Amino acid sequence: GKQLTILGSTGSIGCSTLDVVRHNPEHFRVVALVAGKNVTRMVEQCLEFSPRYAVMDDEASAKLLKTMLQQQGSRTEVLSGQQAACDMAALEDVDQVMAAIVGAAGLLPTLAAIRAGKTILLANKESLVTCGRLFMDAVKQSKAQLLPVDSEHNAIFQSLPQPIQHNLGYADLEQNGVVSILLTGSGGPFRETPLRDLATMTPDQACRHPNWSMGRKISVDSATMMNKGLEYIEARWLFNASASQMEVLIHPQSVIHSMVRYQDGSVLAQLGEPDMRTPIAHTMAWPNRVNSGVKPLDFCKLSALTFAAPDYDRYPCLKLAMEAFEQGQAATTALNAANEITVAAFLAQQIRFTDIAALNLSVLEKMDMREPQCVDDVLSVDANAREVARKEVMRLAS
Amino acid sequence: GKQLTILGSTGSIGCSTLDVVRHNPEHFRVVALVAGKNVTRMVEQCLEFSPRYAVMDDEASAKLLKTMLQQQGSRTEVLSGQQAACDMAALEDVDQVMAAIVGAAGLLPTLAAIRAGKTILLANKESLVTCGRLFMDAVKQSKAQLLPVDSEHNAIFQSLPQPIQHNLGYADLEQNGVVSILLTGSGGPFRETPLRDLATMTPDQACRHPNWSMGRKISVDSATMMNKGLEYIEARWLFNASASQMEVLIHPQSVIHSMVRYQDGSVLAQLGEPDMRTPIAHTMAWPNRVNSGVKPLDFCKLSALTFAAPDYDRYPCLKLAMEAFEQGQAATTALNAANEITVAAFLAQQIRFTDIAALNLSVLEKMDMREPQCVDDVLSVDANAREVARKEVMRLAS
Ligand SMILES: O=P(O)(O)C(Nc1ccc(Cl)cn1)P(=O)(O)O
Numbered sequence: 048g049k050q051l052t053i054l055g056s057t058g059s060i061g062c063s064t065l066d067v068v069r070h071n072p073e074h075f076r077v078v079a080l081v082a083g084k085n086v087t088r089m090v091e092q093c094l095e096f097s098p099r100y101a102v103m104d105d106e107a108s109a110k111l112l113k114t115m116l117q118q119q120g121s122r123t124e125v126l127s128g129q130q131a132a133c134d135m136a137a138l139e140d141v142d143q144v145m146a147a148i149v150g151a152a153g154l155l156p157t158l159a160a161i162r163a164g165k166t167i168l169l170a171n172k173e174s175l176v177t178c179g180r181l182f183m184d185a186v187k188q189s190k191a192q193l194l195p196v197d198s199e200h201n202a203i204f205q206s207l208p209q210p211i212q213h214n215l216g217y218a219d220l221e222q223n224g225v226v227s228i229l230l231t232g233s234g235g236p237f238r239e240t241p242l243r244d245l246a247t248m249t250p251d252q253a254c255r256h257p258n259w260s261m262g263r264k265i266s267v268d269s270a271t272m273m274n275k276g277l278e279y280i281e282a283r284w285l286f287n288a289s290a291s292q293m294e295v296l297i298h299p300q301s302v303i304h305s306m307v308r309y310q311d312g313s314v315l316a317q318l319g320e321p322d323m324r325t326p327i328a329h330t331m332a333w334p335n336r337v338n339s340g341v342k343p344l345d346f347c348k349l350s351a352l353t354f355a356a357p358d359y360d361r362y363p364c365l366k367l368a369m370e371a372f373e374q375g376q377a378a379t380t381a382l383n384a385a386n387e388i389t390v391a392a393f394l395a396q397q398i399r400f401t402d403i404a405a406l407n408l409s410v411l412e413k414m415d416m417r418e419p420q421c422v423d424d425v426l427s428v429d430a431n432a433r434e435v436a437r438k439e440v441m442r443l444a445s
Numbered sequence: 446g447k448q449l450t451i452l453g454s455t456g457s458i459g460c461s462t463l464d465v466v467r468h469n470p471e472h473f474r475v476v477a478l479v480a481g482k483n484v485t486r487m488v489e490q491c492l493e494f495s496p497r498y499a500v501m502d503d504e505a506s507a508k509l510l511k512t513m514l515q516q517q518g519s520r521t522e523v524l525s526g527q528q529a530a531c532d533m534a535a536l537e538d539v540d541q542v543m544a545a546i547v548g549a550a551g552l553l554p555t556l557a558a559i560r561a562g563k564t565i566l567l568a569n570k571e572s573l574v575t576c577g578r579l580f581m582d583a584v585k586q587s588k589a590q591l592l593p594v595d596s597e598h599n600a601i602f603q604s605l606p607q608p609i610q611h612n613l614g615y616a617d618l619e620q621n622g623v624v625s626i627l628l629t630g631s632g633g634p635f636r637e638t639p640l641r642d643l644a645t646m647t648p649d650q651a652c653r654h655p656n657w658s659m660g661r662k663i664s665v666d667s668a669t670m671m672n673k674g675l676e677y678i679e680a681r682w683l684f685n686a687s688a689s690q691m692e693v694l695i696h697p698q699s700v701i702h703s704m705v706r707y708q709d710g711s712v713l714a715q716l717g718e719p720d721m722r723t724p725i726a727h728t729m730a731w732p733n734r735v736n737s738g739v740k741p742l743d744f745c746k747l748s749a750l751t752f753a754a755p756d757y758d759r760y761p762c763l764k765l766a767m768e769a770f771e772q773g774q775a776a777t778t779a780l781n782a783a784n785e786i787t788v789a790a791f792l793a794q795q796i797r798f799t800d801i802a803a804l805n806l807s808v809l810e811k812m813d814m815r816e817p818q819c820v821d822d823v824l825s826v827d828a829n830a831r832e833v834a835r836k837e838v839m840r841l842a843s
C-alpha cells in the first residue's frame with residue numbers, strides 16, 4: 048500500500064481523493080491530512096481514515112479539532128501552521144503527496160514535497176502559474192515525480208509517451224516524437240453569443256457552466272477562457288513545451304479532455320466523464336490503474352463531438368495569458384492575481400463581464416517588475432498586482 | 446538503423462512503407478523485397494532502395510526481373526517461390542518484417558518471421574483470423590514482437606499501456622487496468638438504409654465506402670460489417686481479450702480509429718487522417734516516432750463525431766463473426782473462406798447482398814473438421830470451406 052499526506056483534504060479534490068482510497072483501502076493508507084478551518088469535516092476524515100497526523104492552518108482550529116478527536120476517542124496527533132503542513136508533505140514514510148492547497152498557502156508545502164522527492168499529485172495546478180521555473184528546477188534536481196491532477200493536464204499526461212511520463216518537465220518533446228500538446232476547453236457559456244452582448248452578460252449567466260457545474264469564480268474563468276490561459280501557462284512548464292508545441296482548441300462537449308499530436312500524424316486523446324475521481328485515481332495508481340467509482344463513458348449517449356479555434360476577440364484573456372508567458376513569471380503571477388481581483392469584482396457586480404479582460408491587461412501594463420527568484424518574491428508581485436487591480440476596479444466604479 | 450524485409454512490397458501497404466523509408470533514409474534500410482508478378486514496380490523499388498534480395502511468385506517473373514535489373518546495373522539477387530519468401534522473413538540480419546502478403550499465401554512467410562523471433566509489422570489479417578491461436582502461441586515461444594499495422598488494431602495498441610505493448614497476447618488486460626477494447630467502424634454505406642432494401646442493393650452501391658476509397662471486396666466487407674467481425678476475431682487473439690472485454694462501436698466519420706477503456710473511467714483513443722502511412726510509420730519506429738509524410742489532422746475541418754451501437758439485424762455478419770470465434774479457428778477460418786466466395790459471387794451479381802451473410806452462416810453449419818494444429822490444417826479447412834461455399838452459390842443461382 049502507498050502512504051500519502053493530503054494537502055487540503057477537506058476541499059472538493061481532497062474529498063474525491065479520499066473517496067478513491069475508500070474504494071481501495073488495501074492500496075492506499077492515509078498518513079496525514081492537512082486542511083484550513085473546516086474542523087467538522089476534518090473530524091470525520093480522521094475518524095474514517097485513521098491518519099497519524101491531522102493539521103489545521105490555525106491554532107484555534109487545531110485545539111478545537113483536538114478536543115473533538117479525543118472526545119471521540121481518536122489518537123490522531125493534531126498540529127497547525129504552515130511549517131507543520133510542510134513536514135507532513137516531507138514525511139519520510141509517505142510515498143505520494145496530493146497537493147490540493149490552492150493559492151499562495153499551497154506554495155511552500157508543495158515545494159517541500161518536491162525537495163523531499165515525493166511523488167506529487169499536483170492539484171494545486173496554479174502553483175506552476177507563479178513558480179513554474181522554481182518548481183520544475185526543484186523537480187529535476189530531486190527526481191520527484193510530478194503527476195498532474197487537473198483534467199486537462201492529466202489527459203495530456205496519459206496521452207504522452209512513457210519516457211516523458213517519467214521525467215516529466217525535464218524531458219524533450221520533439222525527441223520523443225511529440226509535435227504539440229492540444230489543450231481543450233468548452234469555450235464557456237458565451238461561446239455563440241454576439242460579441243456586442245458580452246458587456247451586458249450577468250454573473251448568473253456567466254456562471255452557467257456549459258456541462259457540469261462548478262464554483263462561481265472558476266465558472267467565469269471558463270467563460271473568459273482565462274482558465275485555458277492559466278492551463279496553457281502551466282502546460283508549457285509542466286511538459287517543457289514551446290509556443291509552437293501548444294495548441295488551444297474549443298470542444299463544447301468536453302468529452303475529450305485534451306490530446307497530444309505525434310510526428311507520424313497520430314493524435315492520442317483521453318476521454319471520460321466530468322468526474323475528478325478519474326484523473327485523481329489515475330495519478331494515485333500510476334503506472335497502474337484502480338477503480339475510481341466513476342461510471343464507464345457511454346458512447347451511445349453523447350452529443351456529436353465538435354471542435355473550433357478560439358477567437359481572440361471573444362477570448363482576449365486567452366491571448367493575454369499566452370503573451371504573459373512570453374513576458375515571464377512576473378507577468379503570469381500578476382495576471383493570475385489581477386484576474387482574481389477582477390473576477391470577484393464582476394461577481395460582486397462592480398464591473399462588467401468585458402472589464403475583466405480590459406482590467407487584467409491594464410494591470411499587466413502597469414506592473415513591470417523584477418522576475419521573482421523565490422516564493423517570497425512571487426508573493427510580493429502577487430500582492431502588488433492585487434492592489435493595482437483593486438485600485439482600477441475602484442477608479443472604474445467611481 | 447533498422448534492417449527490414451517487406452513481404453508484398455508492390456501492394457498498397459508496401460509502397461506506403463517504402464515512402465516512410467524514403468522519408469527516413471538514416472533509420473531504415475531495405476534488405477529484401479518480396480512480391481507476386483508486378484515486375485515493373487519491383488524494378489523501380491529495387492532501383493530506388495538497392496535491396497540485397499528480391500523474390501517474385503514464380504520463375505517467369507523472376508527471370509524477367511533478374512534480366513531487367515542486370516540491364517540497369519542493379520546488383521540485387523533475384524529469387525522466386527514461397528520458400529524463398531519465407532527465407533527472406535527469417536534473414537538473420539533482419540530486425541523487422543512488414544508482413545503485407547494477404548490471404549492464405551503470406552501465412553507461412555509471416556509465421557517464418559515469428560518463428561525467427563523478429564519484429565513483425567502485421568499487415569495481414571489472415572494470420573489472426575485463421576491461425577489466431579497458432580500464431581499467438583508461436584510469438585509466445587519465440588518472443589517475436591507483433592506490431593499491428595491495420596488502422597483499428599494499431600489504434601488500440603497505441604492506446605494500451607506499455608506493459609501490454611511489449612507482451613502482446615501474453616499480457617493480462619485486467620491486471621493492467623484495462624476494462625475493454627473499443628473497436629470502431631464506419632457502419633458502411635448502408636448504415637441508415639431500410640432493412641428490407643438491403644436485399645436489393647447492387648455491387649456499386651455496396652462499394653461506396655463512406656469516407657475514403659478501397660478495394661471492392663473490402664468495401665463490401667465494410668458494408669456488411671464483416672470487416673469489423675474479422676477484426677473482432679483478431680483483436681481477441683492479439684490482445685488476449687474475452688467477449689466482455691470487447692466492444693464494437695459505429696463511428697461514421699472514422700476520425701477515431703479505435704479506443705480502450707480503463708478501470709478508472711479513462712478512455713484513451715487514437716485519431717488521425719485516413720492515411721495508412723501513419724500506423725505503418727508508428728510500427729516501424731516503435732517505441733519511438735518518425736515523420737510519415739502524413740499531414741496533421743485539422744480539428745477545425747471535421748464533421749461532428751458520432752457513435753452508435755451496431756444492430757445485428759442490420760449486420761448479421763458481425764454477430765456471425767463473434768459466434769465463430771467461440772467455436773474456434775476452424776469456424777473462423779471457415780467463415781473467412783466462405784465470405785471470400787460469397788462476396789465475390791455478389792460482386793459478380795450471382796447472389797443478393799443479403800445472401801452473403803445467409804450463405805456464410807450456412808457453410809459454417811456444414812463444416813465438420815475442427816481446431817487445426819498447423820498452417821497446413823488451416824489451409825485444408827480454408828479449401829473445404831470454399832468448396833462448400835461455391836456449391837451453395839451455384840445451387841442458389843438456379
Ligand atoms: O479549468 P477547470 O477549473 O474548468 C477544470 N477543467 C475540467 C474539468 C472537468 C472536465 Cl470533464 C474537463 N475540464 P480543471 O480540472 O482544470 O480544474
Ligand SMILES: O=P(O)(O)C(Nc1ccc(Cl)cn1)P(=O)(O)O
Pocket residue numbers: 594595596597663667672673699702718719720
Ligand atoms: O477494415 P479495413 O480493411 O476497412 C481498414 N480500416 C480502416 C482504414 C483506414 C481508416 Cl482511416 C480507418 N479504418 P484496415 O486498416 O483495418 O485494413
Ligand SMILES: [Mg+2]
Pocket residue numbers: 595596597598676
Ligand atoms: Mg482493421
